[PDB]
């Protein structure tokens, strides 16, 4: 009645803590635009001001807690399967050869606003590797979406 799985309620406020470095519930517009750069893309500093500007209802200069999902709200019209999966898979796997590279999240996660080396990611990759191989195949990270 109150809780089904603690991950969908507690770990969500764990995900918000990933971007919001201040802990007050606000991140810089430089980070959000970096979402493309995880795909090994281009940072939308100027365009995310076009989204921070509209979502800063409580005008944080940055972005607040409730108006965060509203930017995702416009494009959240009917989600796709493997297209939305690849929007996290090839976005995650810097190589994509049946295994995910170790030094990838230090590359990507750093781009996601948490500057760290493979060491910190190693615990992050170890979670995907039950055999402790230091890399992530399709089957282990797959498991992570059936249980986000």
């Amino acid at each position: 009645a109150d809780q089904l799985t603690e991950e969908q309620i507690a770990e969500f406020k764990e995900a918000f803590s990933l971007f919001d470095k201040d802990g007050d519930g606000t991140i810089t517009t430089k980070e959000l635009g970096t979402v493309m750069r995880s795909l090994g893309q281009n940072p939308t500093e100027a365009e995310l001001q076009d989204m921070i500007n509209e979502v800063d209802a409580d005008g944080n200069g940055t972005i607040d807690f409730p108006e965060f999902l509203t930017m995702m709200a416009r494009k959240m019209k009917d989600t796709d399967s493997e297209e939305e999966i690849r929007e996290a898979f090839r976005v995650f796997d810097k190589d994509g050869n049946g295994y995910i590279s170790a030094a990838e999240l230090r590359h990507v996660m750093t781009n996601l606003g948490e500057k760290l080396t493979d060491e910190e990611v190693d615990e992050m990759i170890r979670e995907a590797d039950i055999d402790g191989d230091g890399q992530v195949n399709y089957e282990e990270f797959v498991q992570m979406m059936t249980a986000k």
Binding site: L39, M76, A88, M109, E127, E140, F141, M144, M145
Partner: peptide, 16 residues
């Protein structure tokens, strides 16, 4: 994190 981070990297499917 490989397990929880999925919801974090997946939030880039709206603008990208």
């Amino acid at each position: 994190t490989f397990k929880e981070v999925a919801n974090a990297v997946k939030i880039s499917a709206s603008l990208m």
